[PDB]
């Protein structure tokens, strides 16, 4: 697992061809949001403060990338 | 003879004791004499002779060790090589 501290680098990673899927994790106790993209070798995580612009980053993310919100319970 | 001259140079004139200060005196070019002990490492001895050859400085090979060179200087520590910058009242340079 790798952490990305640059929005531009995260945008290029999400536009890589091997980016199979993406998910959004919300931590309201910490008041943060996490964008996790699943590539071939590494899972890349971008950590942001919970904000409207952090929500609008979805619009800058590519459309063909299947993005989903993490549920409260990881049901097996 | 050489010990008495060195002791009077210690009393009157100016010296520097040690390899780095001797090299500094040779680089400055104000060194009047260089003394190298018998048990000095051969590489260091050859480098000191090369520095003195470039600076036109006489070299005396002290037959004693570094302990005896320090004792002849009158100090309580060893001394592999030294530089005499001022002869003072001695005739150690005229030899």
């Amino acid at each position: 697992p790798q952490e990305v501290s640059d929005i531009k680098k995260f945008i290029e990673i999400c536009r890589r061809k091997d980016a199979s899927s993406a998910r959004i994790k919300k931590n309201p106790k910490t008041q943060q949001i996490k964008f996790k993209v699943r590539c071939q070798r590494f899972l890349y995580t971008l950590v942001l403060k919970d904000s409207d612009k952090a929500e609008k980053l979805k619009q800058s993310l590519p459309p063909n990338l299947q993005i989903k919100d993490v549920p409260k319970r990881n049901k097996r | 003879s050489i010990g008495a001259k060195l002791a009077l140079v210690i009393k009157s004139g100016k010296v520097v004791l040690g390899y780095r200060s001797t090299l500094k005196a040779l680089r400055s070019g104000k060194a009047k004499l260089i003394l190298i002990a018998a048990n000095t490492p051969p590489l260091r001895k050859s480098e000191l002779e090369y520095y003195s050859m470039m600076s036109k400085t006489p070299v005396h090979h002290y037959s004693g060790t570094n302990i005896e060179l320090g004792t002849a200087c009158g100090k309580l520590f060893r001394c592999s090589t030294m530089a005499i910058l001022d002869a003072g009242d001695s005739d150690i340079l005229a030899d």
Binding site: - | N39, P41, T65, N66, I67, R78
Partner: protein
Amino acid sequence: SKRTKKVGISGKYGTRYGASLRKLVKKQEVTQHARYTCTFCGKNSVRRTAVGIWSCKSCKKTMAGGAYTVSTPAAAAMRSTLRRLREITEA
């Protein structure tokens, strides 16, 4: 503070092996555990590594010497007569 009257380093043996043998081993133990002045760097840091092997801690030089002393009187006399024989041969 002197703790033993005469056994010295041989006090580790207690009452064993005999007074004469303890006195014989004491001198070898003392001269083999003493520190010696180096003939290359002038520091007092030459100690025995193995049998007849004497190493200096400072300048990292290893010399071949006697079993319990750095130099043997036979070896020193050998060096003297070798020097005079070499002088005779060259002259």
